[PDB]
Design a protein around this ligand. Structure first.
Ligand SMILES: Nc1ncnc2c1ncn2[C@@H]1O[C@H](COP(=O)(O)O)[C@@H](O)[C@H]1O
Ligand SMILES: Nc1ncnc2c1ncn2[C@@H]1O[C@H](COP(=O)(O)O)[C@@H](O)[C@H]1O
Ligand SMILES: Nc1ncnc2c1ncn2[C@@H]1O[C@H](COP(=O)(O)O)[C@@H](O)[C@H]1O
Ligand SMILES: Nc1ncnc2c1ncn2[C@@H]1O[C@H](COP(=O)(O)O)[C@@H](O)[C@H]1O
Lengths: 315, 315, 320, 320
């Protein structure tokens, strides 16, 4: 009923009988995301190219947008960013009770070819230190992502399923476009970098073979891989299927990051009725041991993820 | 020096000692592209969702934008659109000498997952009929594409190499960001739907094997496939490598369309020093026989395309 | 504060007031309608009306009204709305009913749309006292919050919830209002006077005497400058930020004034008073007028207190 | 025509004139600077100044000036520029030199930025007669093209290249100016008069007599309405589209007028004349004044011809 993400989030906080602290935190995150979308679409580019006579930065700017909007919310005590070596402890004067792990601009190596890129975040309730960010994903309070693709979208869950919002740039607000989205039980797309096939384990090799060469008279799955995690994960949510960045010979711990990439999208996919696993346990059950820890990631439609796990247990 | 695409195109027409007719045509195309970018990013979405009490269309709108901007230019006599069964003959009162083939919104099945999508066009100099659009790609006067990705970009050539422009949404104009772009002689990315491997020919199977399992001590290529042709072709241009939608058992004539998909991107890639082939001849040398003809498409860095052709000739 | 955006700022003020979140949702709703109106006023989508895809004022009035009514009703915070555009009060559907009453002019500055002059949106919010138009007939002393949006060279909102006036500017690249001045105070005395002197023939003696003294001062000072955009929000906002006086007094052709008490004069009188200025009908504060009908007119004289005092002095002298 | 956008329209007019494309490139350049200025006036990027990423008027003047100067110089169409913001004429670098001279006010309406009133950009283009400021001292009769942008509730450009006045509105969703009225003609007689009556004490007899007749007509008609935004582009544009009269005459404190001949009065006089109106100093057409210095001031009275005639009549009578 509420139409805009601002009114929707407020109304959900009123229903939760919250003090307004998490609401201010979500308000601040979403404001950072609007500022990042504006910069990603290249507002102001002409000034860069000398229109007024004056002729990686996006990484730094997006990081600064999130850090400053979150710290000034008075809702946080600890932040972990993909862009910072150490946890960032909120100034005592501005301390609230939430911990936020985020990748402010994910996929951002691919800005050069203008691929879809995004922002990922997970929020936890907490003397503050990096240990406060080492909670397993089962403890998530809220999480979500922004996708800067053909349009700008946010996926958000606070524990009651997944809602989708799209940014209307004429209005400057996110509009609710889908409530309580559920992933297909089984899809027909598989998504991984097959350029690593030389380094796969046996299970992964066998699983990919079954997708391309089925034995049960079914059509082979179609393949997609943007190489931008938010884009591939969002397509998996809305179309169904499976997304994988498993461990391989060259990346034995996996490549994607547990705190601010894997846990947030695992939380979204599970809230949507999907599964997300390292191949040996659910991602949300991994007890994090360091803030920039890598883990393997396999997620999507539950029947597809289940077939993958069945290959793993075989081999 | 000219900074904006409008001034650049005008200055190029002055240098060509043109009558202004092709310039008005390019002006009209670019205006259509700005209108499409605005709609693709979802300006006005909130009005759709009832903000004022009033609660495939993008395909139709983009088609109408291009057709109306081109016809009203007074520069055209024949249009071919991906969206129309028959060629569209310009009203005699508005007739000029150019023929335009275009796909007004390509990749547009993928709007639902917000994948990058685009607009592709090729322009020919011409009693007008569909036969006027059946010229081989060697006859192209100008061609290019718009990519609606993390930002909006245009690639444009009028026969003197490829220039890249980016839309600054704060200014409302395209800004020149790269002049005379040249593709790498050899890249390290291969791009195709391996979900069709069951249906590949021997050459394609062998080529993909060599990318994943090289014999000369080199690292395997990385794999990318957005499944949106403009996005994959633009990444091939700026990063190098190879893009393929070859014929297969299920699509024996190929899938992509010669007039308004394959010829325009072949023209751009060759202008940039790359190669584009059906696997039996250069795309730009194919003599079109029908306006919605399909052809196989293999293009990108010349050494990569050459390795592919060497596999084809082998098998 | 540190809140930076209007959204965080309004939320935080609601937290401090220990509200239930109902007035916050109402204010969020109004401000969303104001952003939608700004977009339309600046003519987003004009090219489509002029046939870019092959298909070629009252418009904008109706649209702006529909934006405000729908955003307010769907907030679940309202029971009664009064609009400049509707003859009767609009009663909120019972299942959406909350406790607030909103009086608004969704797009003020009619004489000016066609020449692109600055125009605006004006509103005042009351708490209800079964709902009916009588809930909107409260004197301005009962205002809970009030404000205006100015669609000028940039889009600005002035808002007060009873602790002074704060000014916010819309950053169109961000899509949000940014706090640019907190607790603004009007100058004690200005140097601009603002009224339509084309009604000179119809003025009362007091107005004639006051205007004459602005042009031909008796104290050795320079005459005041004159400005009159003819769009009340633009003139009142300049009065707020530069000081001076704005007037649309009663005259022979408009013996009760021209401007509307509920949704033009009360809201701006509240803003001006909250900023340390004065707002009078000429005989009493605008905020003390007891409304008798929802489209009632009243005379309006407002701005810097020394200036409004000099005008009231002309009134009492000429009335004695 | 059918051209729809300002870009196609200007290109097509250049094709019809059989130009080399040099004036077209100059006009494209000016219009790009105007879009960049509109974006900045509406405060794109404000949130970044206020610290959204941790980093917290004269500004806008300098920016707008730099936008116009760089876009014009890089067109390769110019040899001499005169700006309201620069003491001396600006000579184009020899390797960028073309044949046109441009006089402009990059951001007119200073008294109004802070209160967000409508403001604008004004320009006039001449063909050169080695380049120096003398190439800018041509009377307005030699104008090749002239125009203004109004940053009001929406952004509008008025442009004439000598075949009447066309009006274009910026669609900010598209990023282009759209033709909204071709060959606009001012009313023969209006019902609005526009001047700063705060200078009444300093007026000449003619101005005093004229203003008195607007408020107290002698012919049984209703008095004229008054409007005065105090930003010349806004007042002149309203005069164009609603009719009536706009004045900033000489007065005792400004005996040669206040507004600037080269880049305020000549351009708008050209626009007004092209639309069938009159523009006078009070003693001769503005376009006939032979400029003697690049920041020369002149009195300006312009608008509907019957109104300007009634003002000129007051002048001749009171001068006899
Ligand atoms: N806007 C919201 N949406 C959903 N849940 C919320 C919201 N605000 C608060 N909650 C829930 O209530 C708890 C307490 O909120 P808070 O008092 O603001 O820290 C949160 O940790 C959430 O579980
Ligand atoms: N803006 C332009 N950029 C590059 N080449 C152009 C341009 N305008 C015209 N030409 C070239 O000159 C030819 C004649 O132009 P036209 O007289 O406008 O039909 C074209 O077919 C192009 O080869
Ligand atoms: N966001 C706010 N800003 C200022 N005052 C507020 C706010 N929200 C609530 N209040 C005050 O608290 C009262 C009750 O709030 P509510 O429970 O939301 O109706 C209001 O009528 C205001 O006086
Ligand atoms: N785009 C245009 N619109 C109207 N008149 C033009 C245009 N371009 C050129 N002209 C006229 O033709 C003359 C010579 O043009 P140019 O060769 O571009 O300097 C100009 O000084 C104008 O009088």
């Amino acid at each position: 009923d509420m139409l805009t993400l601002t009114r929707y989030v407020m109304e959900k906080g009123r229903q939760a009988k919250g003090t307004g602290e998490l609401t201010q935190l979500l308000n601040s995150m979403l404001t950072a995301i609007k500022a990042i979308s504006s910069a990603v679409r290249k507002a102001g580019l002409a000034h860069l190219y000398g229109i007024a006579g004056s002729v990686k930065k996006l990484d730094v700017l997006s990081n600064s947008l999130v850090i400053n909007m979150l710290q000034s919310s008075y809702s946080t005590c600890v932040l972990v960013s993909e862009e910072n070596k150490d946890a960032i402890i909120t100034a005592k004067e501005k301390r609230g009770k939430y911990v936020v792990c985020f990748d402010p601009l994910d996929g951002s190596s691919n800005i050069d070819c203008l691929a879809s890129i995004g922002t990922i975040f997970a929020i936890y309730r907490k003397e503050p230190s990096e240990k406060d960010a080492l909670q397993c994903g089962r403890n998530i309070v809220a999480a979500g992502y922004a996708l800067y693709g053909s349009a700008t979208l946010v996926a958000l869950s606070t524990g009651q399923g997944v809602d989708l919002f799209m940014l209307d740039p004429a209005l400057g607000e996110f509009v609710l476009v889908e409530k309580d989205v559920k992933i297909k039980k089984k899809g027909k797309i598989y998504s991984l970098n097959e350029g690593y096939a030389k380094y796969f384990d046996a299970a992964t090799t066998e699983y990919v073979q079954k997708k391309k060469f089925p034995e049960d008279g079914s059509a082979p799955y179609g393949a997609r891989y943007v190489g931008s995690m938010v884009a591939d994960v969002h397509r998996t949510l809305v179309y169904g299927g499976i997304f994988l960045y498993p461990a391989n010979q060259k990346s034995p711990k996996g490549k994607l990051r547990l705190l601010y990439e894997c846990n947030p999208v695992a939380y979204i996919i599970e809230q949507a009725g999907g599964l997300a696993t390292t191949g040996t346990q659910p991602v949300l059950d991994v007890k994090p041991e360091a803030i920039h820890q890598r883990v393997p990631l396999i997620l999507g439609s539950p029947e597809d993820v289940q077939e993958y796990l069945t290959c793993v247990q075989k081999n």
